[PDB]
Write a protein that binds this ligand. Structure first.
Ligand SMILES: *Cc1cc2c(nc3c(=O)[nH]c(=O)nc-3n2C[C@H](O)[C@H](O)[C@H](O)COP(=O)(O)OP(=O)(O)OC[C@H]2O[C@@H](n3cnc4c(N)ncnc43)[C@H](O)[C@@H]2O)c(*)c1C
Ligand SMILES: *[C@@H]1O[C@H](CO)[C@@H](O[C@@H]2O[C@H](CO)[C@@H](O)[C@H](O)[C@H]2NC(C)=O)[C@H](O)[C@H]1NC(C)=O
Ligand SMILES: *[C@@H]1O[C@H](CO)[C@@H](O)[C@H](O)[C@H]1NC(C)=O
Length: 498
């Protein structure tokens, strides 16, 4: 009996399933569902939700669930694009880590211990409250949890300078399938490597990350300028942007959010500079005069204030609120990574289809900088030198447009088909934090599939990790040979050991 086991093991914060919309269960369940595509009355629901309040409670929670027949699901921020943190094709128990959100900062070693329920915003806020000369590289989305984010890499506006979030992890507490509490020394370098980008929900439950805090100026510079132009000018802006974005010095980042709310397009250029406005403006006057950036556009502020700004927030304090939803639309998204420059016709066609769909968006980021200097096998994220751009295709819709779902999905699929010849090939690359099930999936309940799991999973595995896929399988076998931690695209162990 799970409730008996949990009670005896001192795990008191738990709620069983209830169909009552007003129950604590239903509220907790939906509190961290960040993609409404997976909220509806259909879709798998957990038999119980458990909120461990300590690493020991997390350890025993894992032990208890497993004594039953249940599949374990871990949820930090709940931002899984495919809702893999709170859904399962088999009966499951949901471990919600929201009560594990403590940040301990050591200003002397300039490191920090971060409980895996902590959101990026909670982390950013905690850093500012301790220092104005320190920051950390990760996503702009403040409600994204460190649990899944760092586990899958973690790309952000400072990654051209400092690489991924996972690239700056120096230790971690990992709790395995037996509840064993392990640090870097205990888990070994192969497992410690795998958790730094190998994908969440595969290796065990990360209790906490030990991260290196990174030097930032007292004042940095950001700007957000939107250009409402025609497809023809937009195409030329984007065709030049790709070179600027990648070629910029590592102290710079220029990102693009694109949409066509009509059949003209809008382009929002987002810029960041580790320094003051004069060096920032001088650089873009030179490299990108077409943006029409003036002195008034360059805003100086603290690092924390900049990330609050880039997140579309008003104050630094709003970073420390994990339940703040500025958007609440269902969505599906895909991503490409490029090796060769995109011809002008690539952007043209992309914007063309964008105009045909007002609920469609794109997000564009250049790599280069330090992303080119980090070895491809430093951590599981393989897309380093030779990788030019990350291109995200998104379609999102509210509760009014629900019936147009299959329409929206057909659009995205065709956008993706169109971009096929211009982006990476053999294999077509992906990013594990941009988990995409269109690429396929494993049924761990089908014994035929499971026995050939490695070669079946090699499809998406090499797309996410390339040649790092092989080492990940070994690390999986070291830490979870019986595959207690699994989902449709989780790394398979060396064989079926059950
Ligand atoms: C919603 C959202 C996602 C974003 C955004 N912007 C991003 C960006 O600028 N850069 C990025 O690199 N990624 C961005 N993403 C995507 C997120 O990076 C991913 O969606 C993260 O994986 C989200 O992490 P989290 O919020 O924790 O997602 P969950 O659904 O809770 O978990 C995902 C996955 O990880 C496993 N897992 C969670 N917690 C743990 C622990 N402690 N240990 C092991 N495994 C864990 C889950 O089981 C699940 O499988 C911008 C926005 C708005
Ligand atoms: C289980 O954990 C939740 C989350 O921390 C607890 O809920 C919080 O309770 C405090 C005060 O009791 C409120 O200020 C918070 O707003 C609550 N959070 C949420 C998300 O509702 C809950 O009390 C815990 N339950 C038990 C039995 O320990
Ligand atoms: C199990 O998987 C194999 C291969 O994917 C398939 O041929 C078989 O029909 C599946 N079994 C069931 C019951 O679906």
């Amino acid at each position: 009996d799970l409730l008996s086991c949990l009670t005896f093991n001192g795990v008191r914060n738990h709620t069983v399933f209830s169909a009552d919309s007003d129950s604590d269960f239903n509220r907790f369940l939906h509190l961290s569902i960040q993609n409404p595509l997976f909220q509806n009355s259909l879709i798998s629901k957990p038999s119980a939700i458990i909120l461990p309040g300590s690493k020991e409670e997390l350890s025993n929670t894992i032990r208890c669930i497993r004594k039953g027949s249940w599949t374990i699901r871990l949820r930090s921020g709940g931002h899984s694009y495919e809702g893999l943190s709170y859904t399962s094709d088999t009966p499951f128990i949901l471990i919600d880590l929201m009560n594990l959100n403590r940040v301990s900062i050591d200003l002397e070693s300039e490191t920090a211990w971060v409980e895996s329920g902590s959101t990026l915003g909670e982390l950013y806020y905690a850093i500012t409250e301790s220092s104005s000369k320190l920051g950390f590289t990760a996503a702009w989305c403040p409600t994204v949890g460190t649990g899944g984010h760092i586990s899958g890499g973690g790309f952000g506006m400072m990654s051209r300078k400092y690489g991924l979030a996972a690239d700056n992890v120096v230790d971690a507490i990992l709790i395995d399938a037996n509840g064993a509490i392990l640090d870097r020394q205990a888990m070994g370098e192969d497992v410690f490597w795998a958790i730094r980008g190998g994908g969440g929900g595969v290796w065990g439950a990360i209790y906490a990350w030990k991260i290196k805090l990174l030097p930032v100026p007292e004042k940095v510079t950001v700007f957000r300028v939107t250009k409402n132009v025609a497809i023809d000018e937009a195409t030329s802006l984007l065709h030049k942007w790709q070179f600027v974005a990648e070629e910029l010095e590592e102290d710079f980042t220029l990102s693009v959010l694109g949409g066509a709310d009509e059949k003209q397009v809008w382009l929002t250029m987002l810029g960041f500079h580790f320094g003051l406005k004069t060096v920032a403006k001088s650089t873009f006057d030179l490299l990108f005069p077409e943006l029409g950036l003036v002195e008034e556009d360059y805003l100086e502020m603290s690092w924390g204030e900049s990330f609050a700004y880039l997140a579309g927030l008003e104050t630094v304090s709003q970073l420390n609120n994990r339940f703040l939803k500025f958007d609440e639309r269902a969505f599906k998204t895909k991503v490409d990574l490029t090796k060769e420059p995109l011809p002008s016709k690539a952007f043209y066609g992309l914007l063309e289809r964008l105009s045909k769909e007002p609920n469609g968006f794109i997000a564009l980021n250049g790599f280069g900088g330090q992303m080119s200097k980090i070895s491809s096998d430093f951590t599981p994220f393989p897309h380093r030198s030779g990788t030019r751009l990350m291109v995200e295709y998104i379609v999102a819709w509210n509760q009014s447009e629900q019936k147009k779902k299959t329409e929206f999905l057909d659009w995205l699929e065709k956008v993706y088909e169109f971009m096929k010849p211009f982006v990476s090939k053999n294999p077509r690359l992906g990013y594990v934090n941009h988990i995409d099930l269109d690429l396929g999936g494993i049924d761990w309940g089908n014994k035929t599939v499971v026995n050939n799991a490695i070669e079946i999973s090699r499809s998406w595995g090499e797309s996410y990790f390339l040649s790092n896929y092989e080492r990940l399988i070994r690390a999986k076998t070291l830490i979870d040979p019986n595959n207690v931690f699994n989902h449709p695209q989780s790394i398979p162990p060396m064989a079926n050991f059950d």
